[PDB]
Design a protein around this ligand. Sequence first.
Ligand SMILES: C[C@@H](c1ccccc1)N(CC(=O)N(C)C)C(=O)C[C@@H](Cc1csc(N)n1)C(=O)N[C@@H](CC1CCCCC1)[C@@H](O)[C@@H]1CC(C)(C)N(C)C1=O
Ligand SMILES: C[C@@H](c1ccccc1)N(CC(=O)N(C)C)C(=O)C[C@@H](Cc1csc(N)n1)C(=O)N[C@@H](CC1CCCCC1)[C@@H](O)[C@@H]1CC(C)(C)N(C)C1=O
Lengths: 334, 333
Amino acid sequence: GNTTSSVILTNYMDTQYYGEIGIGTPPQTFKVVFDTGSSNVWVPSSKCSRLYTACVYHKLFDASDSSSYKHNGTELTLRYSTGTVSGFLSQDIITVGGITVTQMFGEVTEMPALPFMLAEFDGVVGMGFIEQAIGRVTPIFDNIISQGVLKEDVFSFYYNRDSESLGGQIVLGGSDPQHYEGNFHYINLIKTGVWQIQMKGVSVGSSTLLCEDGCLALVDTGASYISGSTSSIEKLMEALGAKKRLFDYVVKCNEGPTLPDISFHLGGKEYTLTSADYVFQESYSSKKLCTLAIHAMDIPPPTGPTWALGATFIRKFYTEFDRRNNRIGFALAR
Amino acid sequence: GNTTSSVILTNYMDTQYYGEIGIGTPPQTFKVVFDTGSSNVWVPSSKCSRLYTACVYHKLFDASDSSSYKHNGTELTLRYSTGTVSGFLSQDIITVGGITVTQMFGEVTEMPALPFMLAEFDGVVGMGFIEQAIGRVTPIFDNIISQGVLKEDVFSFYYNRDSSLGGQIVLGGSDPQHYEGNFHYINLIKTGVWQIQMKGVSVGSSTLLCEDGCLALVDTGASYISGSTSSIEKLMEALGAKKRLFDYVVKCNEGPTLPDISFHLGGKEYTLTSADYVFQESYSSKKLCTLAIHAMDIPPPTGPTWALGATFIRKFYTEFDRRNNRIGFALAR
Ligand SMILES: C[C@@H](c1ccccc1)N(CC(=O)N(C)C)C(=O)C[C@@H](Cc1csc(N)n1)C(=O)N[C@@H](CC1CCCCC1)[C@@H](O)[C@@H]1CC(C)(C)N(C)C1=O
Ligand SMILES: C[C@@H](c1ccccc1)N(CC(=O)N(C)C)C(=O)C[C@@H](Cc1csc(N)n1)C(=O)N[C@@H](CC1CCCCC1)[C@@H](O)[C@@H]1CC(C)(C)N(C)C1=O
């Protein structure tokens, strides 16, 4: 076909990038997160216990105000690495920047405070294959593709950096030659079903101080940070001088602007992040500490163990999620 | 051609703005400073001596690492206003934005603490004309032009106030996201150098400095605006700034109090307020804030000149027009 669409994204702190979707007629608008580590949608439910503060604090979907709605009803649990969310399935029309799909989605009626209370977005839009969908429900894009609108069978990520800007943007169908420079480098996934890519190594410094003899890289938009297995990060951090705490990694602020280059030996290229890319310099004091933008995560099999290239890296490199030919391409951005 | 290549820039303390470049095959990455005041490209040699604490903390070029690398060994001393550096000439491919070109880069081997240590980046990329070149080696832009890939033979500069995005260079034109209105150019007095002529420095209402013509280098790799010791001396008096052990400070609390400083360029006035000159770390009556202007005596031939640095560039988006050999300005955003 010939459709191209955007979805304008709001960059909230370099940690959260959400768009907006509408469900039901009249539309009920929601701040969702576009997530290539999942294949499901879900948005708070009217039916949700108000004893769930997140449910007091977000926008709930009320089906009784949706003439376009078809009760389904199956319980589903969406457990993500940072938190779980049980609910049940409904169906209605979703409007995703341009495209209308009768989406099969889920009414979250148990929304935990941790993390959700710190969430700026209401729900999530999974952009991973059906080979991961809980309940085996045909995923949003999978529906846009069965629609024959799309000029091209790809979706691309642009993640801006903050402003005191244009936050980011997805493009369903195409790519945006005003977000990148040069040309793409294509890496083609291992199995289909997961956005993974083989990684030939990780160089903090110059020396491949990690992933020598390869490892795997999952490409995910729903990840604020870069993640690497526990020991993998233990070592990286070690190299790097970083203080391991509870949730994040730290560094004397002043220390920041000199932390060495870290590189991803990806599909043959070397994808380097300099410390201006992984260091949240909110200062240069010897007294204040500074939060890196990399952090462990042990991902259990079957997907894991993997490195997860989140928001951190998509911010430096435009990413082309290519369904047709089944591969992912990156470009340097603008 | 029809390309255009931005290079995102880091801003270390509103004083240093540096981007990345990659040399050789495979590309090897360094942090550089794109200098309109210089015309040689140089980065540390791996051949650089450990005793130089400097090379010690700075990215180095292992030529063994580049397949494309080509030998030249012709010795090079580069001598800047705040330092002299020195090594020999090499030849590889350079990446700049999505652009890639073979260059005559210098591979540094004698590099001092002062200033070298100050530096957060590793090298320099001189956006100067050939004319002002050591070894008379064609400057980087000089090649790229010839590559015939870029739409316009111009490069823009956006310096950002620090608090993000700290700057960005446009090789091939301008990023209209970063300027307000249109440019008002200013012809080069003459090729070779990036210097226009100023018709007067104002303190509020009146010209005081530069009553009958002066020079102004618009320079990207100089932090502060500079004047001759003797004009700046006059300048700090109208202000009531005081030299303090090093440079001129103010009682922060009195920032808001100071007269706008005005650069008469090509008929129009380029006007900087306190907001833009003082580094108001605070608004304390208890603190001294420092100004972002310095006395800096440039030698003949290029001197005496005023020199608009990052201070001024922060305000006025700069357009370096190779083609017309003019310099255009516009309000950054
Ligand atoms: C803590 C969590 C969070 C908190 C509040 C609000 C929003 C998000 N964060 C922010 C965060 O990590 N920092 C450091 C602030 C995530 O990025 C969440 C990210 C954690 C992570 C895992 S690997 C990595 N690099 N980061 C994740 O779970 N991301 C989920 C989807 C989330 C989208 C936003 C709503 C919550 C679910 C799947 O991408 C991950 C990836 C995959 C497939 C391995 N897997 C099974 C998952 O569950
Ligand atoms: C210390 C020096 C520096 C150098 C290296 C690293 C860190 C800092 N600094 C910061 C500085 O002086 N303050 C006060 C922040 C410069 O701005 C440097 C600037 C000083 C200057 C001269 S006129 C003026 N207003 N400011 C300069 O010498 N700039 C050089 C090239 C430098 C680029 C960064 C690496 C060190 C060399 C040419 O632009 C100048 C311009 C000209 C024409 C005077 N000439 C011959 C030069 O060599």
